[PDB]
Amino acid sequence: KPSEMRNLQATDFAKEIDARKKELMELRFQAAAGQLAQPHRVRQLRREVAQLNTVKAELARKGEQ
RNA sequence: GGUCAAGAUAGUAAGGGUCCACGGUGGAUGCCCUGGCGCUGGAGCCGAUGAAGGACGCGAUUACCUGCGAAAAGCCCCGAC
């Protein structure tokens, strides 16, 4: 997040996936994850690079034409 | 009252039947927004920038279906609200 890459092409976000999506799969597990905690902070930030790879093949298509 | 007597013929009927009360899994009529028939008026497929429709596909479950399968209930934009 956010919609900040509406103006930034330079492969920095290239490893942005390595951020929270690295051990939130280690919170996506069964038990000791979040039942009464803040359960929602999983696939509520898993569209973290999804629906954001749009205008990424319809904007980032900027190669040379 | 009584000894004797037959004559006269009486109830129960284990079970049942003429009549009522209380009743079944089943169940139609009265009746119910979608589900069927005949129809007016319009519209009347997409097409290797690849279609009908299926198979196996996401939400702390997913199996008959909504969308979509991994960017699977949905994303540019303008817009309704």
Q: Which amino acid is at A27?
A: L
Q: Which amino acid is at A21?
A: K
* Nearest nt by C1' to A6 Cα: B76
- Tell me the backbone φ, ψ of residue A42, rounded to 5 degrees: -140, -100
Method: X-ray
Stated in angstroms, how far is A57 CA from B45 C1'? 29
Q: Which amino acid is at A24?
A: L
User: Which residues precede a break in chain A, with C-to-N distance above 2.5 Å?
Assistant: none
Q: What is the structure's resolution, reported in angstroms to one decimal?
A: 11.5
Name the residues in A34-63 having a C-beta closer than 7 Å to nucleic acid strand B.
35, 39, 42-43, 47, 49-51, 53-55, 57-58
Which nucleotides of chain B have an atom under 7 angstroms from any protein CB?
58-60, 70-76
Contact A47, A22 (CB under 8 A): no
